[PDB]
């Protein structure tokens, strides 16, 4: 116990927290890996996502090398303030913090070859630009970009520790609406006016699950359009029934659209769901216009030829539109 | 290794933090530089926009000049308390912070001549009044105003380093509804009672996209109006049909208008 305490004091005595390992020399290589605890929120209205992780970084500092102690000293977290650490930061982050219960969730471990392990439990709200032009039939690319703030590639170098196995826990993530299809790790050197800065990128390819929309959106619309087709098969002189059925189908379509888009995220530009709902709206509107034509031509001023054409045209036209929609967007 | 340490220790010795460079001399000429990353969440209800940027201030302190070390230092956080920096602030801010994870996103870089570069990574929520009398066909002009808090123009003088090239990364912003038509930089002296304070200003012109509104709001109402007109071709004798059509069209219009209010 006395030997270990004196060794730790010697390591921390005469130590500068202001020069990178091997200051004058080749750049210090920092190997980093992440364990994704969870991905909680994925907000399209804000175009971002919340991510909790066990960030971990490894470097080699000869100034913190000790001998005679055959064990890996896991020191108290506060010693991180007394040692040099990288200035790593998340470039596409909007707000982040380190958990502080029961204490600061931080880790310092000094191996006897100078290899320092530094760990942090971090929650980040990372920005994820999205392309909701095929919504809900969309597949996003969310990313996390990690970069050194002050140093450049001539001083600090980044690499994924363990290759493709650096990021773990992605398989265990159960998102409610999305499904994680793939994750990719990339390492680059972004060139700036000052110089080349190292960068790492963790890219998830989320795919939206069309099981909620198919149950709430498309089925009511199709059934209401079919009910307008039912309105076609009624007598021409029975004006009250046909008019009520058509106009109430229009009202039901407006109700569906309003309540749906109120419940759904609000994104102010065109989406596939809007095109489908509006095609259904146009079809139900055309049904009532068709009845107006029938009433004016014949009853106003038994075959009912317009009805005979409509009975075949409208289902065929709607089927063609449905196939075009489900081919273009899928 | 120790040489630079003793050099910076000597630099800090005899330095007055409370006093700007050249207290009696001409004003310190401080240059501003901004690299934008997002103008996300341009709220209409709150009349503000959230802006993330990298913000450099560049000046020349002769008190911190050093020689014999051709390397430019990157001495950061102990200096963040132990050196004078400009008191620059954003006038139309409502809430702002400096990103702190993993470390405090701040950078002080010294030079042998005495030049100091001070970079921060700042997210702010800047107010932007909007004239919605032509909404959704409106065109707004948001601004970020940068100003020295206490010092007057005879003490500190702001300018845009690099001229019109000071602000970069405008192309990186991609808002859902708006589209940046133009960005402008301005430098003025605002005359308060105390004196003429410096000011810099970064203005953006935002044009709103109309496709969502015409798809969802306008011509659906046109279609419902046409359905109302359909009543005129129905026979006058029929009463239930025409009354039902008219009143249900009225109900549908009220529903549409009211729900459009409920999300706007």
């Amino acid at each position, epitope marked *: 116990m006395s030997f270990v305490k004196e060794t730790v004091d010697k390591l921390l005595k005469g130590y500068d927290i202001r020069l990178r390992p091997d200051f004058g020399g080749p750049p210090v290589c920092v190997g980093m890996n992440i364990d994704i605890a969870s991905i909680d929120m994925v907000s399209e209205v804000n175009m971002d996502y919340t991510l909790t992780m066990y960030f971990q970084q490894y470097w080699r500092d000869k100034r913190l090398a000790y001998s005679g102690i055959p064990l890996n000293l896991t020191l108290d977290n506060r010693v991180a303030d007394q040692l040099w650490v990288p200035d790593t930061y998340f470039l596409n982050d909007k707000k982040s913090f380190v958990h502080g219960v029961t204490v600061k969730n931080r880790m310092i471990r000094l191996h006897p070859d100078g290899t320092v392990l530094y760990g942090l439990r971090i929650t980040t709200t990372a920005a994820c630009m999205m392309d909701l032009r095929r919504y809900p039939l969309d597949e996003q690319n969310c990313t996390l970009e990690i970069e050194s703030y002050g140093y450049t590639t001539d001083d600090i170098e980044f690499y994924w520790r363990g290759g493709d196995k650096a990021v773990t826990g992605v398989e265990r993530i159960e998102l409610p609406q999305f499904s994680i299809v793939e994750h990719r790790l990339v390492s680059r050197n972004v060139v700036f006016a000052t110089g080349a800065y190292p960068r790492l990128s963790l890219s998830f390819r989320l795919k939206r699950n069309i099981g909620y929309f198919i149950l709430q959106t498309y089925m009511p619309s199709i059934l209401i359009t079919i009910l307008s087709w039912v309105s076609f098969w009624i007598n021409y002189d029975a004006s009250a029934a046909r008019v009520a059925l058509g106009i109430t189908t229009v009202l039901t379509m407006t109700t569906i659209n309003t309540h749906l888009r109120e419940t759904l995220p609000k994104i102010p530009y065109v989406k596939a769901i809007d095109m489908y709902l509006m095609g259904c709206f146009v079809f139900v509107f055309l049904a009532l216009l068709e009845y107006a034509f029938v009433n004016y031509i014949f009853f106003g001023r038994d075959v009912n030829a317009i009805d005979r054409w409509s009975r075949i045209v409208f289902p065929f036209t709607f089927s063609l539109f449905n196939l075009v929609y489900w081919l273009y967007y899928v | 290794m120790s040489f630079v340490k003793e050099t910076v220790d000597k630099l800090l010795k005899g330095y007055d933090i409370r006093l700007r460079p050249d207290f009696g001399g001409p004003p310190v000429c401080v240059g501003m530089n901004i690299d934008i990353a997002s103008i996300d969440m341009v709220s209409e209800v709150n009349m503000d926009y959230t802006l993330t940027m990298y913000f450099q201030q560049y000046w020349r302190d002769k008190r911190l000049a050093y020689s014999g070390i051709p390397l430019n230092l990157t001495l950061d956080n102990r200096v963040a308390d132990q050196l004078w920096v400009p008191d620059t602030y954003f006038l139309n801010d409502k809430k702002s912070f400096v990103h702190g994870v993993t470390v405090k996103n701040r950078m002080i870089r010294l030079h042998p001549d005495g030049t100091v570069l001070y970079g921060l990574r700042i997210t702010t929520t800047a107010a932007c009044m909007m004239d919605l009398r032509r909404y959704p066909l409106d065109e707004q002009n948001c601004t970020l105003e940068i100003e020295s808090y206490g010092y007057t123009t005879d003490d500190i003088e702001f300018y845009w380093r690099g001229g019109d090239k000071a602000v970069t990364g405008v192309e990186r*912003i991609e808002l859902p509804q708006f589209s940046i038509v133009e960005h402008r930089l301005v430098s003025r002296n605002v005359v308060f009672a105390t004196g003429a304070y410096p000011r810099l200003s970064l203005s953006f012109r935002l044009k709103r996209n109309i496709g969502y509104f015409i798809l969802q709001t306008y011509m659906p109402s046109i279609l419902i109006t046409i359905l109302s007109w359909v009543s005129f071709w129905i026979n006058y004798d029929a009463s239930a049909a025409r009354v039902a059509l008219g009143i249900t069209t009225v109900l549908t219009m009220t529903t549409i208008n009211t729900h459009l209010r409920e999300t706007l």
Partner: nanobody
Amino acid sequence: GSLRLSCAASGHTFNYPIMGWFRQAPGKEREFVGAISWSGGSTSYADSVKDRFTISRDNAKNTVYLEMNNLKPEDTAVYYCAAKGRYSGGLYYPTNYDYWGQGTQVTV
């Protein structure tokens, strides 16, 4: 005198929104000429080619049009079209651009 190049893109264009034009004169290093964003309203040109160039974009057919004006003999070069991803770096450097074009020769 008057030219109009049209660089079209196919694939995951949303992943690479910031699309730019470079030019390489024969025996010279590649240089920046212009850049444009996803919305097609944030053009940025190099000082050496300002006030005589224009860039426009359309997304219904994913293409960027480079519209020329009164040229100079130095303008002869192979003009390349490149794409860059969000959170990549500066505009003026070609190493930050991932996917390049084949390059079209122009002589005046």
